[PDB]
Each structure stands twice: as C-alpha cells, then as structure tokens.
Amino acid sequence: EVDYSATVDQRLPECAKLAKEGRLQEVIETLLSLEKQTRTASDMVSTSRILVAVVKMCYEAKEWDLLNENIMLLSKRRSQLKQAVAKMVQQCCTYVEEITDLPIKLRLIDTLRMVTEGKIYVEIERARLTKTLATIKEQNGDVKEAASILQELQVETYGSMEKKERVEFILEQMRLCLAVKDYIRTQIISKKINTKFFQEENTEKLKLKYYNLMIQLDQHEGSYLSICKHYRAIYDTPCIQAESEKWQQALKSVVLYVILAPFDNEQSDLVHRISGDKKLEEIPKYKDLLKLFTTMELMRWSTLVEDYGMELRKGSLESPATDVFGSTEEGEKRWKDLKNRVVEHNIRIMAKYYTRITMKRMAQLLDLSVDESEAFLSNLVVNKTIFAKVDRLAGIINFQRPKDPNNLLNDWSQKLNSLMSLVNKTTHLIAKEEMIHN
Incomplete structure (x- = not known):
C-alpha cells in the first residue's frame, strides 16, 4: 500500500526516549x-x-493498569490486522513469563486470555497462557481449579499447534485430572491421544508419561490386562530398552500383571507372546514364575509363596522389586488377587483332568478351608467361568456336564472318522514301506 516503513522507524526511538524521560500518556x-x-x-x-513498542513501553515503565488498558484498546481497534495482534500477544506472553508478582501476572494473564479468546491466529498463545495459568493455579494449591481450567481447552482442535505440544497439553490435562481423582474425565481425555504418534521420531518422553498416566488410571479400576499392555508398551521404548535397570523393571511388571489378569483367550495369548521373549532369562525368577502359570498342572499357593514371595514382595538388592506386590494397600490387594488367580488356575486344571473330586480334596489342593473353597467355586460357577455341580450332602464336585445323546454319539462318530483317516494314512505308509523294501 503506502508502505510507511521508515516513517515508524523515525518515530519509535523518539517516543521510546520520551517514555524513558517520563512522558507516556501523550x-x-x-x-x-x-x-x-x-x-x-x-x-x-x-x-x-x-503495538509491540506500545506494550513494551507500558511494561518497562511498570504501568500495569495502563498496559492492560492498552492491550484491551489495541486488540479492539476497528479492522485491526490479525498478525499485528498476534505479534503483540506473543510479546506480551514473554512479559507474563518475566513477571513474578502473582496478582499483576494473574491480571495480565486474564487480560491476554480474554483478548485472545475465540481467535484462531492467537489460539496457541491462549493455549500456552492457559497452561501457565494452570501452573499458577496448581503450585499455589487448588488443584481442582487448575484441572478445570486446563480441561476446557480442546487442544485436539488447535490445528496450528504442533502435534508434540498438543500431546503434551493432553498429557498435562490427564495428569491434572488424575491429581483431582477424575478417572472418568481422565479416560475421556485419554481417548484424544493416538498411540501411533509414539512410533514417530524422538518423543519417547511423551510415550513414557502417557503410559505411566494410563497405568495410574487403570490401577484404580483394577483392569490388570490393560495395565500389562501399557507396561509392555513401555517395555518397547528404545530409551527403556537401552538400560538394564529400566527394561528389567518394565518386564517384571509386564509378567506380574499378565499373571494377575484373569484367564481368557487374550490373557493366554499375551502370556504366550511374553514367554517368547529371551530377555526374561535375565530375570529367571519371574520367567519360571510365568512358566508356572503356563504349565497344565496344579500349583500350590504355599510353594509359590515360599519360592517367590520374597523376590516379588520384598525383592532383592540385586533385582529390585516392583510396586506390584508392595507393602501398600494396592500391593496387598494385588497379592490377594494373585492368590485368587492361583486358586482359579488350580480349579481350571482340576476341571480339565478330574471328573469328580471331593470337596475335602479340593480344599486341600487349593490351600483353602472347605467353606472358602466352596465359596470360590460357587462364585466361579455363578459367573459361568467353570461348570461344577456340588453335591454338598456327599461332599462331591462334578465337573462332568450331563451327556447329551447328541454329544455322546458325536464323540462316537468323531472316533470313527479319526479311525478311518488313520487307517487310510497307515495304508499309505505301508505303501511307502513296500516301495522302499521291494
């Protein structure tokens, strides 16, 4: 257009000198x-x-009220250039960072966040400023207010922000929600992060923070399998997988949480996947323990305790123990859940092999009293986990379902089919042997 250029070049130092002299309002x-x-x-x-010179002038002269009024007026000028306001806010947030007085900084933050509200070109600044505000509203107590302030920021919609900074914002939102114990909101915010972003270039710190936050979130609910998956995701980070003290702890937690997860197709698949790892040999006590949950035999709770409890609960100086079975309340609950998993695995094995078993023998093999074993079996049966009929008068447990004539005759027919196939295969093998020795 008219290209003032040097016209402001002449003016700006002159007015700066006058401002230093004391003349500001004029x-x-x-x-x-x-x-x-x-x-x-x-x-x-x-x-x-x-605009930058004006805000700098009102800042260096400590004209806080004048600075706020100037920001309000300059942002509200008719047909203002958006980039000029963007540069002015970018210069003002630096003053926000420099200011240490809490009331003045808070008022300046409020003014900046109210002039930048609803404008795309300053969406990043109003984001970062909000973060700063949240920090101010957390280091001075009142974590609930900071969580509320940072929660309303829909950072996922902010297109100009870098994906890395967007992920950092979401992580901070999740951490504040966890600090105020807002696990439902923590899940809702966690849904905003695509885990594939952690397969990119150097962002492993964000991956570790995200997965630790998810571990904390899922620990309260008790979803052991999800916790194991999160720990497995931590285990695959190059940073953790480069230091023994880190990946060993991660894999210890992986094993201890895949064990705690209730048995299903997913849990068995995860156990098989983990057992294929060779790094387990660096921690045999855990690896053998996993083998104990893979073998199709009975395992005794007393033997399991006397062989692994010290290495799991108290641990060793050479191999530190994870907080999975620590002395805290969560550790005690996880220890009880481990005992439940052990007895349930024993009941599963006893259902695969036994057809009928005495309640006394079941209690003896479960390291439980008759009443405790019967209650656990009843809980399993009601949840349709394991079929069993308890003739309590005779103290008998029947794992054998009534035989449908369809089922019996189908077993007979399957035996006939296998017999015929084996006869054919034997005939072919006989033909090969005739060829070789003729």
Whole structure:
C-alpha cells in the first residue's frame, strides 16, 4: 500500500526516549494516532511494531493498569490486522513469563486470555497462557481449579499447534485430572491421544508419561490386562530398552500383571507372546514364575509363596522389586488377587483332568478351608467361568456336564472318522514301506 516503513522507524526511538524521560500518556496517544494511520494503510509490519513498542513501553515503565488498558484498546481497534495482534500477544506472553508478582501476572494473564479468546491466529498463545495459568493455579494449591481450567481447552482442535505440544497439553490435562481423582474425565481425555504418534521420531518422553498416566488410571479400576499392555508398551521404548535397570523393571511388571489378569483367550495369548521373549532369562525368577502359570498342572499357593514371595514382595538388592506386590494397600490387594488367580488356575486344571473330586480334596489342593473353597467355586460357577455341580450332602464336585445323546454319539462318530483317516494314512505308509523294501 503506502508502505510507511521508515516513517515508524523515525518515530519509535523518539517516543521510546520520551517514555524513558517520563512522558507516556501523550506518547502512547501519538502511537495511537500512528497506529490508526498504519492500520488504515493496512501496513502489517508497521502496525505490529507499533503495538509491540506500545506494550513494551507500558511494561518497562511498570504501568500495569495502563498496559492492560492498552492491550484491551489495541486488540479492539476497528479492522485491526490479525498478525499485528498476534505479534503483540506473543510479546506480551514473554512479559507474563518475566513477571513474578502473582496478582499483576494473574491480571495480565486474564487480560491476554480474554483478548485472545475465540481467535484462531492467537489460539496457541491462549493455549500456552492457559497452561501457565494452570501452573499458577496448581503450585499455589487448588488443584481442582487448575484441572478445570486446563480441561476446557480442546487442544485436539488447535490445528496450528504442533502435534508434540498438543500431546503434551493432553498429557498435562490427564495428569491434572488424575491429581483431582477424575478417572472418568481422565479416560475421556485419554481417548484424544493416538498411540501411533509414539512410533514417530524422538518423543519417547511423551510415550513414557502417557503410559505411566494410563497405568495410574487403570490401577484404580483394577483392569490388570490393560495395565500389562501399557507396561509392555513401555517395555518397547528404545530409551527403556537401552538400560538394564529400566527394561528389567518394565518386564517384571509386564509378567506380574499378565499373571494377575484373569484367564481368557487374550490373557493366554499375551502370556504366550511374553514367554517368547529371551530377555526374561535375565530375570529367571519371574520367567519360571510365568512358566508356572503356563504349565497344565496344579500349583500350590504355599510353594509359590515360599519360592517367590520374597523376590516379588520384598525383592532383592540385586533385582529390585516392583510396586506390584508392595507393602501398600494396592500391593496387598494385588497379592490377594494373585492368590485368587492361583486358586482359579488350580480349579481350571482340576476341571480339565478330574471328573469328580471331593470337596475335602479340593480344599486341600487349593490351600483353602472347605467353606472358602466352596465359596470360590460357587462364585466361579455363578459367573459361568467353570461348570461344577456340588453335591454338598456327599461332599462331591462334578465337573462332568450331563451327556447329551447328541454329544455322546458325536464323540462316537468323531472316533470313527479319526479311525478311518488313520487307517487310510497307515495304508499309505505301508505303501511307502513296500516301495522302499521291494
């Protein structure tokens, strides 16, 4: 357009000197007139410098009220250039960072966040400023208010923000929600992160923070399998997989949580996947333990305790123990759940092999009293986990379902089919033997 350029180059140092002398209101009025001229001229580079010089002038002179009023007026000028306001806010957030006085900084943050509300070109600043506000509202107590302030920011919609900073914002939102114990909101916010982003270049810190936050979230609910998956995701990070003290702990937690997960197709598949790892040999006590949950035999709770409890609960100096079975309340609950998993595995094995078993023998093999074993079996039967009929009068447990004539005759027919196939295969093998020795 008219390209003022040097016109503001002449003015700005002069008004800066006058401001240092003490004249500000007249000087800021002169810059208001010059800003009007540039804005009508639509000179982006001149208007941005004018606004930046104005806010710097009101900042260096400690004119906090004047700075806030100038920000309000300059942001609200008619047909203001958006980039000029963006540069002005970018310069003002630096002053926000520099200011250490809490009330002045808070008022300046409020003004900046109210002038940048609902505007795309300053969405990043109002984001970062909000983060700063949240920090101020957390280091001074009142974590609930900081969580509420950072929660309303829909950072996933902010297109200009870098994906890395967006993920950092979501992680901070999740951490604040966890700090106020808002696990439902933590799940809702966790849904906003695509885990594939952690397969990219150097962002392993974000991956570790995200998966630790998810571990904390799922620990409260008790979803052991999800916790095991999260720990397995931590185990695959190159940073953790490069230090023994880190990947060993991660894999210890992986094993201890895949064991705690109730048996299903997914749990068995995960156990098989983990057992294929060779790094388990660096921690045999855990590896053998996993083998104990893979073998199709009875395992005794007393033997399991006397062989692994010290290595799991108290641990060793050479191999530190995870917090999975620590002395805290969560550790005690996980220990009880481990005993439940052991007895349930024993009941599964006893259902595969036994057809009928005495309640006394079942209690003896479960390291439980008759009443405790019967209650556990009843709980399993009601949940349709394991079929069993308890003739309590005779103290008998029947794992054998009544034989449908369809089922019996189908077993007979399957035997016939296998017999015929084996006869054919034997005939072919006989033909090969005839060929070889003729």
